[PDB]
């Protein structure tokens, strides 16, 4: 059974870029949407729209890449270099505000989920809150 939604999402995204897809479908949800709101907002991905996939509601996430390389194997610098659920089910990891992690000397980001909204590290720290640390993307 699908055990972890978000991980499946993140993982659909990774698994795509690696093979360089223009876009990737993914079952939709009032949260997976909120996370995706950030990926676009930050710039890891072009964007996303609600799409009817065989009667079922999906999210077309529009992947983004870098330019065509020189010399041999011109597979473009990936925009989303790294991405992984930090907090997993059966191991949910919550963090205090003073405890929000800096990512890649601050270059990547961290998506949490606060009682105030799905946030970035920067925004979280600005708001003075913390919570379910969702994933590391950089």
């Amino acid at each position: 059974m699908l055990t972890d939604p978000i991980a499946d999402m993140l993982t659909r995204i990774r698994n795509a870029t690696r093979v360089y897809k223009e876009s990737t479908d993914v079952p939709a949800s009032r949260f997976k949407e909120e996370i995706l709101r950030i990926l676009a907002r930050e710039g890891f991905i072009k964007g996303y729209e609600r799409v009817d996939v065989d009667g079922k509601p999906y999210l077309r996430v529009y992947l983004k890449y870098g330019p065509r390389r020189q010399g041999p194997d011109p597979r473009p610098e990936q925009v989303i270099h790294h991405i992984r659920r930090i907090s997993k089910p059966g191991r949910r990891v919550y963090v205090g505000v003073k405890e929000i992690p800096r990512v890649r000397r601050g270059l990547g980001i961290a998506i949490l989920s606060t009682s105030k909204g799905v946030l970035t590290d920067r925004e979280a720290r600005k708001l003075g809150v913390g919570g379910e640390l969702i994933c590391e993307v950089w």
Binding site: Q70, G71, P72, D73, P74
Partner: protein
């Protein structure tokens, strides 16, 4: 120059041995054969030919390479027309990575041409004569067109990219631009300037190259 809608010649070649990455350049399958979408080949030609004008008038050098049996008698022709170098007979591994080691082979031709004009011919052992006569023989095959290469070429014009993926490999590593007349079986993801089209067909190779060269010349003003 530009081409017509010459569709009575290119519209696919290979059976079902294709490379999934080529999909972007196919129309559909007919009688078990892939058919290249020409409306698209026009979009690619209009760029590749741009590159060549750029090169040409900039006074550049394009190595023509095609070891295919069918393109043999064509490659020779076309290159000869610009002032372009070309690889006809067989492509020597390293004619670009190990150029300085091969260019040496070139000088060996240079030095032998000399002896077979000078007085020191019949005068000296004849065993060596034959021995030396054969060396030119072979050189006047492989190097026939490479000779024109004073230094590594600004671009390569390859015909069957998948057959010459050695040449392509090399070039790719030395950052020399790649131009190839490609199709169904190639990895477009590695050819700087593609030209999707049939190629076993003399009628195809011939057109693709002639229109290129005419571009080449009109570029320099002749």
């Amino acid at each position: 120059v530009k081409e017509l809608l010459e569709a009575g010649v290119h519209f696919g070649h290979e059976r079902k041995r294709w490379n999934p990455k080529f999909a972007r350049y196919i129309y559909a399958e007919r009688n078990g054969i892939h058919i290249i979408d020409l409306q698209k080949t026009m979009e690619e030609l209009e760029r590749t030919f741009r590159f060549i004008e750029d090169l040409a008038m900039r006074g550049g050098t394009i190595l023509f390479v095609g070891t295919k049996k069918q393109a043999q008698d064509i490659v020779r022709m076309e290159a000869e027309r610009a002032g372009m170098p070309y690889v006809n007979q067989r492509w020597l591994g390293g004619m670009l990575t190990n150029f300085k080691t091969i260019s040496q082979r070139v000088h060996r031709l240079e030095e032998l041409e000399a002896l077979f004009a000078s007085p020191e011919i019949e005068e000296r052992p004849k065993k060596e004569q034959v021995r030396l006569k054969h060396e030119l023989e072979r050189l006047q095959k492989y190097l026939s067109g490479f000779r024109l290469l004073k230094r590594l070429p600004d671009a390569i014009f390859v015909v069957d990219p998948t057959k010459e993926a050695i040449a392509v490999r090399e070039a790719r590593k030395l950052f020399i631009p790649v131009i190839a007349l490609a199709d169904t079986d190639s990895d477009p993801d590695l050819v700087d300037y593609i030209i999707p089209g049939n190629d076993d067909a003399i009628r195809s190779i011939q057109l693709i190259l002639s229109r290129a060269v005419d571009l080449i010349i009109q570029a320099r003003g002749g």
